[PDB]
Structure formats: C-alpha cells, structure tokens
Chains A and B, each alone.
With several copies, the nearest count.
Chain A
Amino acid sequence: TGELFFRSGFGIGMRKDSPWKQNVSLSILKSHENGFMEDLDKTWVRYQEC
C-alpha cells in the first residue's frame, strides 16, 4: 500500500582514489541504454503475478 516517497536510486561503493569511476559508469550507461536492464528486470523480477 501507500505511495512512493523519498525516492532514490542505487549505487556502487568504490574508494575515492579508484581509477575505475568512468570505466564503470560508461559500461553501466551502455547496459542501461542497450536494454540489458529491462531484460534483467523481466527475467528476474516479473516471474508471476497475482
């Protein structure tokens, strides 16, 4: 029940000196824009309904 409030996303915990910031952000954005995220959502979170 209820409605969405204090909406916020997820994240990846990395140290501030890690040089993998852009190399991971670009890959995440590419996966998001190539439809991998929606496919994973369909194949892992929408098994059955009521």
Chain B
Amino acid sequence: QRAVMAVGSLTINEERSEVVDFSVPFVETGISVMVSRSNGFLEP
C-alpha cells in the first residue's frame, strides 16, 4: 500500500495476476532472441 498506481515496463505475468490487478495493456511485447547477423549460373 505504498502506491495506488504503478506505471513502467512491467511485464504481465501469472504470478502478478492475482496478487495485484492491471488494466488493458497498450504496447505488446514478449520473449525474443537477439543475435548478431552472420555474413552470407542462371539456374534459378
């Protein structure tokens, strides 16, 4: 009860779903993998 509203980059998770309540999300995101790009006869 230190704050009635929390705003930030808080990812919606199952654990936080029942402990606290959140409104409709405005920006979608999720799990992603970041990796450096690798370099790379009239047939086709």
| From A7, A9, A22, A33, contact of B18 by CB (8 A) | A22
Classify chain B's interface size. Answer: under 10
> B17 near A: Cβ within 8 Å?
yes
**Interface flags, A23-34, vs B, CB<8A=1, else 0:** 001100110010
Find out whether the CB atom of B12 lies under 8 angstroms from the CB atom of A26. Answer: no
Q: B43 on the interface (CB 8 Å rule)? A: no
A-B contact pairs, 14 of them (CB 8 A): A7-B28, A9-B28, A22-B17, A22-B18, A25-B17, A26-B14, A26-B17, A26-B18, A29-B12, A29-B14, A29-B17, A30-B14, A33-B13, A33-B14
* Residue of B with least CB distance to A25: B17
